[PDB]
Ligand binder design. Structure first.
Ligand SMILES: CNc1c(F)c(S(N)(=O)=O)c(F)c(F)c1S(=O)(=O)CCc1ccccc1
Ligand SMILES: [Zn+2]
Length: 258
């Protein structure tokens, strides 16, 4: 009876195994755009993905993960609100059963169809597993997806999904360039928060871009053909793998713009 994205094992149950679920800096949150504070001290985000080296794509049972070789100083996130250098380790998405839901963060209560998480760890902690044990261990760049025109830089991911349909499947995934997933603007909101799945560790500086990317209905439809189950088990479509917004408690969301 492990955690997941259903009635008896979904987000409202996670606190029994992971009591930090009711902690002081949980994610996601609703972003109140009127209450977010413009912070003229915030720097432009520096996203340096030119040398990123993707390796593989994996269905981990609740998302698909595009993994990068993070053993050199390649794909890094810096600036913005961050004090160090954070290295890209992987990206994944959260999405809905319907276009009207799927994002984890919300913007004035608006839910997007999906949300992309580009996950980076602080190089001062040496590796990802040590970083998640620190309050400044991770920087996650969150990007909303809306349904409209296709995202061409997404299609290589979409097309490999039929090869990783079920939990535990992987496929080689080299030469994927994550710059194809970024909107034109790097304007953002930022706040201190957590992993949005168990173990829910309070280790994340969230950086959420204001500008969504467009993907086509056919692209998100292929996300929804994935399965939470393993091969040879009853089929459970991988949909609604998002945590709802959590209490903001004693936090301020800062805006890089306006
Ligand atoms: C990639 N690591 C990761 C993560 F990025 C996030 S999120 N949604 O970005 O805060 C999580 F919520 C999260 F829980 C993890 S995990 O590696 O500890 C547990 C395994 C896992 C892997 C992929 C997606 C979610 C959780
Ligand atoms: Zn995520």
């Amino acid at each position: 009876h492990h955690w997941g994205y259903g009635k008896h094992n979904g987000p409202e149950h996670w606190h029994k195994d992971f009591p930090i679920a009711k902690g002081e800096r949980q994610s996601p949150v609703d972003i109140d755009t009127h209450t977010a504070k413009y912070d003229p001290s915030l720097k432009p985000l520096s996203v340096s993905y030119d040398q990123a080296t993707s390796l593989r794509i994996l269905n981990n049972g609740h998302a698909f993960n595009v993994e990068f070789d993070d053993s050199q100083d390649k794909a890094v996130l810096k600036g913005g609100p961050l004090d160090g250098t954070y290295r890209l380790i992987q990206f994944h998405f959260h999405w809905g059963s319907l276009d009207g839901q799927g994002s984890e963060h919300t913007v004035d209560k608006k839910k997007y169809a999906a949300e992309l998480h580009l996950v980076h760890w602080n190089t001062k902690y040496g590796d990802f597993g040590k970083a998640v044990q620190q309050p400044d261990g991770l920087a996650v760049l969150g990007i909303f997806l809306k349904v409209g025109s296709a995202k061409p830089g997404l299609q290589k991911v979409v097309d490999v999904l039929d090869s990783i349909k079920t939990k535990g499947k992987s496929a080689d995934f080299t030469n994927f360039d994550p710059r194809g997933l970024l909107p034109e603007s790097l304007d953002y909101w930022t706040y201190p928060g957590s992993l949005t799945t168990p173990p829910l560790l309070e280790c994340v500086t969230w950086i959420v871009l204001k500008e969504p990317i467009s993907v086509s209905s056919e692209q998100v439809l292929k996300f929804r053909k994935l399965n939470f189950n393993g091969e040879g088990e009853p089929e459970e479509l991988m949909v609604d793998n998002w945590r709802p917004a959590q209490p903001l408690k004693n936090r301020q969301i800062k805006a890089s713009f306006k």
